[PDB]
Design a protein around this nucleic acid. Structure first.
Lengths: 197, 109, 171, 136, 106
RNA sequence: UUUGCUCCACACAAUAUAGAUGGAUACGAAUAAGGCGUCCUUGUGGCGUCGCUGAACCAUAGCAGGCUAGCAACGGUGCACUUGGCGGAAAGGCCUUGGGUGCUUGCUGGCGAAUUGCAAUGUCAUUUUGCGUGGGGAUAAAUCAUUUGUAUACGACUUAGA
RNA sequence: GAACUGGCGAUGCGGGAUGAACCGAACGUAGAGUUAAGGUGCCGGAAUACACGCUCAUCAGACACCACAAAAGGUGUUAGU
């Protein structure tokens, strides 16, 4: 339905979002995921830190350089979870994976575009209230990501600029709604209301 | 030969007197009355192609006068029925196309 | 499955030494007539010296609920076999009909004690005609005056894979 | 000063609460909750809309902001009488929820000629609104 | 106008397959807009064209077409089964494809 | 090194496409809470309204969209300019001033369309390269060989030499 | 090391990821339809179906053959006598 779909990754569950997105890429939809530092994983922070340490133990014994690579950024953690669900070793899998780019924060190509959510992977809609969850940015900076604060500063600046945008947009839409209400109850308005618009 | 005789009218959208297949049209609910048109003249022998020999090959590169005044007779009887309800001339002149978000299994024509 | 209640009346086959046997009757919750008659013969082989080859079934009739739109409280007495022994339990269910009450009973026993249909014996089920004879708190909770409660955290399942606004869980 | 809380009220389930059947055989009609079975299911009745008196899971209905007076366990004659007395059907019809439902089914029931007509009328309305968008 | 589309867009998902054996004779098509077999029953018997391009001009055009039709519904989510004169080349998994409105019943 | 190199405009060829066929349509935060409007003493404030999905909103008529006439407004939109800003996370985009020019389906008219013969994607997109024009722009280095020894199995490295 | 039967050896096919023996079913070459055993988040064809409960593990658990865990305990939590 869309050329590119921009997904705001905030408040989403990692596995459910990855299983949605992998099927979208295999069907041929182009997906870009922004704000990867705000993904959520169900479970305690200590459980997921222990899980990452169990993953971090695994390496090739005779040469660590050819072993499993333990990527530390939240976007690369999401990429790992998604590459697990795409059959990446085939040409179809590579062609699917080249339709995806995942980012921490919202870069300047996508800060002026529209962000969507996936309601079947949202934490507030999936988890029972009371279950504990993690933040992927906190887990990733606990296991070695170096750029948690610069992303926070850039996101603060971007949010200031976006609020400055939204004030003007709200004023303009209030003018347009006022003019539409005053130009209603004419004959064309009543004919459109009879016809359903 | 199980075909439908149709016309534009030719003054409205430039579609002449023609025959079409019933499986390649959509019957809309919009209805006009065609009583007062003498269509019994047309038949399967009225439309003949005059088939071409295999020798005549078009390397690089007209109309029946009987066909053109038959069209002029019928369309002036159709447009008098068109002028009764408003916006039919504009509706017949405009083309049909599917927009984004149009589901043909839910659309009523 | 979705249960129905049947009365099954049967007897022994008549002999010359004793014609007209005593016509025993039982109430069975079962999915259909075949399972109902099988459970009837199962419990009569547990009770009297008879079996299906030596007896016959004179009647089977579905008993549907007399007031299927009255909300009742039922007390249910149950035997079940655990992994180590056999126990008796009494559970009470607030529900609108007997077959639905025993359906939720079978689900409740399978959920909370891992007891299967082959392990559960239904001793009896009876409507509790008077309040304050209700003895369980989980059903006595719903018998209070002007009962009302909210439903927090509404989750609306979507048809599209993409939503264009952040959803709200107000109800 | 005085103490301030955010109240955060929402749509209690009790007797006399009007609900809209979301899915099932009724699927879009109104009913009134007659009694509460347990936490997850209630006994409802919808006698004006033709909904039979039944027990139903609370996930198959949506609670509306409408309430009227009933005693608990009321039979369908009393339910219909109190429904007509409180007159909640046009009170539902006056809401923007029901107007949205009616708009959706009207747009579904439009034909191609009517779609052409609303396109022409929307062009005329857009002309006069964008003409109004030049003086303020 | 600006739109001239008289078809419905669809995606070529895969072949008919088990867990480890595929069957190229039957293709699986996701028609957009439909999410149930009851709505997918409208599209049975409709023609499908896969339209692609090539470098070499054959008979006046550099655009080649593969024709087929919808045969039955597939699953619970509005995917349909489609058969073509020559089977789809399997590099078109995820490629767009056109479902025409003829042969019409309306 | 016989007129080479780069950029700009179109002219023709070739080359392919992981797959245009109306529009990726921009707050943030919370979810046992919010959004919008309005008012005030500007707050963790009062009052009203909305949600219950984008089934939306915008756009959408004309030879794949022609040639003309008029009315009403002083709007809407495209193109090449032009003034002023803002944007460095991967800015390469967003906003704005002024005039020009084209269209206007906001409303009413006049002419054209056939024959692709009862369907045949019935061809309208963008990706790279070459060769021509005619209009600008600029006039280098690296390697081998010689040499060095802070280096060295050989390659490699570090030096020097108009 | 024996008894009865069914198999593998001599046998491919669908399932159990993988495997001689297990489950289903035995095989000419093709087309259409329906299924078995097994499954339907993604890999992966098929409901992020519906319904009632239970469980939060600083080594959870996840399916017969089958790829292990016991005695003894716990105001963890649930249901009972």
């Amino acid at each position: 339905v869309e050329p590119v779909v921009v997904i705001d990754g905030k408040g989403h569950l990692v596995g459910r979002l990855a299983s949605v997105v992998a099927k979208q890429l295999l069907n041929g939809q182009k997906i870009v995921v922004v704000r990867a530092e705000e993904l959520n994983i169900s479970g305690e922070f200590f459980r997921n830190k222990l899980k990452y340490h169990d993953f971090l133990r695994k390496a090739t014994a005779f040469n660590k350089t050819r072993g499993p690579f333990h990527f530390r950024a939240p976007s690369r953690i999401f990429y790992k979870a998604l590459r697990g669900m795409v059959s990446h070793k085939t040409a179809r899998g590579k062609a699917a994976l080249e339709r995806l780019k995942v980012f921490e924060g919202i870069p300047p190509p996508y800060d002026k575009k529209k962000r969507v959510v996936v309601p079947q992977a949202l934490r507030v809609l999936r988890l029972k209230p009371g279950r504990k969850y993690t933040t992927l940015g906190k887990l990733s900076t606990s296991v070695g990501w170096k750029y948690e604060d610069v992303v926070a500063k850039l996101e603060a600046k971007r949010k200031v600029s976006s609020a400055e945008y939204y004030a003007k947009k709200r004023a303009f839409t209030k003018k347009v709604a006022s003019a539409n209400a005053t130009a209603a109850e004419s004959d064309v308005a009543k004919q459109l209301a009879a016809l359903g618009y | 030969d199980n075909t439908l005789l149709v016309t534009g009218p030719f003054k409205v959208n430039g579609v002449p007197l023609r025959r079409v297949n019933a499986r390649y049209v959509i019957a809309t609910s919009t209805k006009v009355s065609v009583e007062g048109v003498n269509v019994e003249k047309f038949n399967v022998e009225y439309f003949a192609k005059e088939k071409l020999t295999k020798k005549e090959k078009k390397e690089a590169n007209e109309i029946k006068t009987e066909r053109v005044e038959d069209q002029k007779v019928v369309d002036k009887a159709l447009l008098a029925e068109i002028k009764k309800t408003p916006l039919l001339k504009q509706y017949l002149s405009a083309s049909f196309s599917l927009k984004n978000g149009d589901k043909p299994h839910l659309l009523k024509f | 499955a979705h249960f129905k209640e049947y009365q099954v009346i049967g007897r022994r086959l008549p002999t010359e030494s004793v014609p007209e046997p005593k016509l025993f009757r039982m109430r069975i919750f079962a999915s259909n007539e075949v399972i109902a008659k099988s459970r009837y013969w199962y419990f009569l082989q547990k009770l009297h010296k008879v079996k299906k080859a030596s007896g016959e079934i004179v009647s089977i009739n579905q008993i549907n609920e007399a007031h299927p739109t009255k909300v009742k409280n039922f007390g249910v007495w149950v035997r079940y076999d655990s992994r180590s022994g056999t126990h008796n339990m009494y559970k009470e269910i607030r529900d609108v009909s007997r077959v639905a009450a025993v359906e939720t009973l079978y689900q409740d026993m399978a959920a909370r004690h891992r007891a299967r249909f082959r392990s559960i014996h239904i001793l009896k089920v009876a409507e509790i005609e008077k309040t304050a004879d209700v003895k369980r708190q989980y059903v006595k909770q719903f018998l209070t005056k002007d009962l009302k409660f909210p439903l927090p955290h509404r989750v609306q399942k979507s048809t599209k894979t993409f939503s264009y606004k952040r959803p709200s869980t107000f109800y | 000063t005085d103490s301030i809380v955010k109240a955060s009220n929402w749509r209690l389930v009790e007797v006399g609460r009007v609900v809209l059947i979301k899915k099932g055989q009724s699927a879009g009609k109104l009913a009134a909750i007659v009694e509460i079975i347990d936490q997850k299911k209630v006994l409802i009745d919808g006698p004006k809309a033709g909904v039979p008196r039944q027990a139903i899971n609370l996930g198959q209905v949506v609670l509306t902001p409408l309430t009227f007076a009933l005693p608990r366990g009321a039979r369908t004659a009393t339910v219909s009488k109190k429904w007509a007395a409180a007159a909640v059907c046009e009170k539902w019809a006056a809401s923007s929820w029901a107007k949205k439902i009616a708009q959706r089914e009207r747009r579904a029931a439009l034909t191609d000629f009517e779609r052409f007509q609303v396109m022409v009328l929307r062009k005329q309305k857009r002309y006069t609104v964008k003409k109004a968008l030049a003086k303020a | 106008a600006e739109s001239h589309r008289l078809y419905v867009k669809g995606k070529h998902l895969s072949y008919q397959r088990s867990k480890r054996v595929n069957n190229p004779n039957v293709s699986l098509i996701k028609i957009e807009g439909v999410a149930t077999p009851q709505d997918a029953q409208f599209y049975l018997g409709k023609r499908i064209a896969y339209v692609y391009r090539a470098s070499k001009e054959v008979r006046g055009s550099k655009i080649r077409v593969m024709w087929g039709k919808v045969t039955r519904t597939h699953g619970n989510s509005g995917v349909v089964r489609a058969t073509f004169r020559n089977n789809l080349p399997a590099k078109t998994f995820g490629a767009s494809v056109r479902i025409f409105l003829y042969p019409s019943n309306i």
